[PDB]
Point group: D3
Chain length 226, copies 6
Amino acid sequence: PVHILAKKGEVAERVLVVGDPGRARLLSTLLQNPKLTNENRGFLVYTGKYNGETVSIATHGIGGPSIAIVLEELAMLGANVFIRYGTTGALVPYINLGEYIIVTGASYNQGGLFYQYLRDNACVASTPDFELTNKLVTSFSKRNLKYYVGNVFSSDAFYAEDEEFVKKWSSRGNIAVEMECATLFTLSKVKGWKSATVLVVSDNLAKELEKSVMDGAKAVLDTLTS
Amino acid sequence: PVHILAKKGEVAERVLVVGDPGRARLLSTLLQNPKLTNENRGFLVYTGKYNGETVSIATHGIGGPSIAIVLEELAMLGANVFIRYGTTGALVPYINLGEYIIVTGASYNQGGLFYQYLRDNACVASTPDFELTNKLVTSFSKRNLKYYVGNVFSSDAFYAEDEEFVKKWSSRGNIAVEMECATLFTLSKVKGWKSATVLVVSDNLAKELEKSVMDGAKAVLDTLTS
Amino acid sequence: PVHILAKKGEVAERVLVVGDPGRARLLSTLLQNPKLTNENRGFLVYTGKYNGETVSIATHGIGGPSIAIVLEELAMLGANVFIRYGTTGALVPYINLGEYIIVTGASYNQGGLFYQYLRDNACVASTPDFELTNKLVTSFSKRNLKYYVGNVFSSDAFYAEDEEFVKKWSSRGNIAVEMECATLFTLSKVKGWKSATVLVVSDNLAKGGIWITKEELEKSVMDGAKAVLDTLTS
Amino acid sequence: PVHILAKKGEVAERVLVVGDPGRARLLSTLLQNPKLTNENRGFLVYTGKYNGETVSIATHGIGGPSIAIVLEELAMLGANVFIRYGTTGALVPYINLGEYIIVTGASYNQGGLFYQYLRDNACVASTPDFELTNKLVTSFSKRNLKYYVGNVFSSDAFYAEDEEFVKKWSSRGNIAVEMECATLFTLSKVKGWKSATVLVVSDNLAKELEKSVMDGAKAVLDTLTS
Amino acid sequence: PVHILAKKGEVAERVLVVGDPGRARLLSTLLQNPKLTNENRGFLVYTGKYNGETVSIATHGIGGPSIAIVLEELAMLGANVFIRYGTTGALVPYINLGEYIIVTGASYNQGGLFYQYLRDNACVASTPDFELTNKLVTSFSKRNLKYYVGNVFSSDAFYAEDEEFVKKWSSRGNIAVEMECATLFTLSKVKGWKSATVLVVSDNLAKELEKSVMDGAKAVLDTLTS
Amino acid sequence: PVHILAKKGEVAERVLVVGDPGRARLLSTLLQNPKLTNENRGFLVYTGKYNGETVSIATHGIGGPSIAIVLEELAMLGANVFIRYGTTGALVPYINLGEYIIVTGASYNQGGLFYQYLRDNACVASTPDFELTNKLVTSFSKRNLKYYVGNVFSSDAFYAEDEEFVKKWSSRGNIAVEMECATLFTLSKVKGWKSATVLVVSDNLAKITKEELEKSVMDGAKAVLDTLTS
């Protein structure tokens, strides 16, 4: 690995990945005896214990290209189970800020990354691991957390304009928008990794926060270690 | 409707759809007091009772264009819950003939039908209803049936040659190939219908039958009426 | 074949193909000693004699994927000449219900079935056999039937909305719309089969108005069937 | 028009178009009292009479962009019937040099020109006028000329390398290759012009001349004035 | 070569290419002892001396397909440096008729020609030779000519309708429109030729000539022989 | 801005952008009175003076989606001149490690980000500002640094396999590969910003120590900063 300079053996098979380095540091406090295993290029990675299992929390930056590089390098270090925990904007009015979305699939526009990996324009099913996703639903349910299950649109251009944005993607079966799920799901299917994703709603395009992230993170860690 | 000319009220909200008219007739024997509600253009549709609920078994023919027409017309008659029960060829060696595959998503090539409905080439997540699919897993498990959960490639050209067929699609996360799931899933997401699919493995491209079909049909009917 | 289950030699070299199995059965009465050679999966196929020549009438269902399978399997059984006889919706106001359209080419949207067969997105000319198509024109004019010659758009989504549907496809040189011609023509060019198509106008998308009656449609379908069969046995 | 400087009334409704200015000048001798009505930018255009009808012979240069400009400007000047008479390379063994090909359709790669005119990538049927093409067949048969009827591939890159060229295009139903038919046919369909094409085989990629060109020109002029 | 019948030794390594045969003949008068080395198919090519160097002035017609053929054939005869001198329509208000545009890149719609040469739909950077373009700036500055530096859109359909044309392309960084630069630049990069382009503004889509063409030609010839 | 949280006026009009936050910090030492104007989400941004001129040094992370967000937010904060200074893999054998490439254009695969911004699949010319790029050449030659001028392929998948990678992109006129060029150039043309790029060769795919690289990075940074404040 040329970006993640973590020593081989310092990265767990089970990894919680987040886009924000700051959330990685904050969530590391939920682990027993956390150690910083990488800080190169700002990609903070911490490894520790939780519920009798070794687990790592890694930063993936923003966007498909960035998360692809991080997943690939983490895997070269032994990682094979990934659960992304990020933030998202809801596309439907009934979902409230601070609530969660357990992702079942990701819509995306065909682009360079998918073409470079798949070698043509086929729309490969971009879905998470079935079992792992059901475990997430069980974990969030046990902790009495308000969640919704559905697909999301993984955008590559946060600031591009689209006057019909909400209607278009919500009418296509998506309940939220973010930027990395499609890449995570598809690359995982291709490489053979088990992945899933849970998102914290930080905005509603159709219409506390710190505690929201912390509570859901515990649910995710229970799933990763169960 | 111009293809399915059944009287409104003669089609249930819950519908089991199969590609073969002969399987529709055979499975109708599992219903209480079944009545043939449509015969036009060979699209046999039967309506009856099962476990205290009215249910219909409909023929959708072969291919995305055909199933799209049938789903649209059945919906115009009141149907909104669809479970396809078809046949498929496995893409991995460990799956045996007669066993089942509960579909979690469908890969497909960019095509006219999707372009016509979506209005551009976006790869919309083609996935089944999360809840309905889990009920299917529960039903098949209760009847002690051997099944596998995973994505499938929905082909539009049964006889097109591809020297790397099995390798390409199995490496893209697909465990079987059929021809209607992508259309069923995507159109359902767009229209707001709840759909799912279970397939009977009738061939293995990488490596009793009547009994298998009948057995699985019972699990599907239990799911539909749960 | 795994969909069309017919015995050895039960399928003729020349086939009249229709989408509706009910039409296959009805037209089978125009033949001598018609025999049901296949009924599996609802794809009714009949083989009999017309003007002393052996021919078959086969059901292809709806859509490119369905007709592709049927054509391939029929070819495996000995067929190499196909004339599709279906129904269509006109895209221009001057064509009336019950009249006919002899197809000269098919417009289509790229992807799926074509990408799998062609191996890339080239727009291969989707045209019928020149000679056979001219024979159809001769046959229809001989029976004093009203027909128009032109291209059609082969749609994959019957119910997909498009607010500019008629002006779009009619401005692109198409006079009607159906769902199987592009697949029939392109697959035939690649597989080495001779194909053609005649359609009965059962709706006009360019102007509102009366619906065609059952008797009217059947009479139109029957009169046209004779012209097609004459061509297939010519 | 800014390329073809001919005045209105100087261009006939019936036009025989050729790519080579030299062929236009050579064929003008078949007309009665031919007059040069344009020479700007090398696009020679002659107008005269043949068989009781006024006809023009116009140069269109090489390629889709060039012929599109010429056709558009000739039409603005009154032209509405066009028959291209060009040279081609056969893609099948049996066709001999000096023989003719009456074009029934044109295959092409989706490109800028088609996208700019059609507004999307639909594969619009690129075919000549049915009636006009049959008249050509009749005219060539009447003059006992050896011809073949079939589709051609309209290439945009004469010198682009493709090791599977002959097999690829011939297996796709094309018997020859040239560069302007697809543009002529599609644009004519959109604009409502009646067009056709006859080609002189000057090379064979799978396996006297001046006379061949002259003989076919007479047959084309007969068709144009029928 | 089958279009440009010039003999080896008759074409210089340095070539000034123009679309109009009439401009080629007009500009040949700027050369010392000009000789016509080809007129086949209207593609006039002249060869003479300028500033102690041998140079050729060649006609390329209109459009990507046509210029591709000419460039490939001139190269087969020894040419390796090409400077296109053409006409263009300004896409911004401030540029006046008769002024010049030194091209820094070309935008284009993916099309047949590019697909045939590149083998896929990648957007390969279509730029001129850096060193040569800078020499052009120097030559025009030295002769006190008013010029602008920027990208142009290379259209394939001069007459295709587009109600948002000026706004669309000018907002994409293009200050003018013409039809051959994209082909010239991309083919040159692939073949290893050194190319550049200067255009004379003959129209402005957002808002003496002989003198402008002549003055600019002298500056181009200075560049070619420096 | 929701990613780059800088106080009003803390971002200069001219910005040197780098992908590695560690490089941003390292180069901030070349400025006068450098101040950390942002650290949110790891996108370190510093503002200070060079040759008496105010400038900023900002981190853009890796990939088109990331640099697009960063450029948009810096522009909202007042920036309109961007020079990317990154690392790259050469695609031709004659370019050596530690040398520099001044970018004249960017090749890329269509889709995603470009489709969303351009609204269709047109291959819009992805080029840097002409004048700014020439100033870079002048600055590097003035400091006697070894550089090459040419196009680069902006890849979206660093680890995607391609058996003909080097031959394919080098035969298409590209002399190096990186990941943010196309997005920077194209977005800049559409948004009306002046941009350019210089890359440090850290690998050669057709065929460097920590000190060799850092020294090369440092020497080139001076030339870029000279251009930005010229």
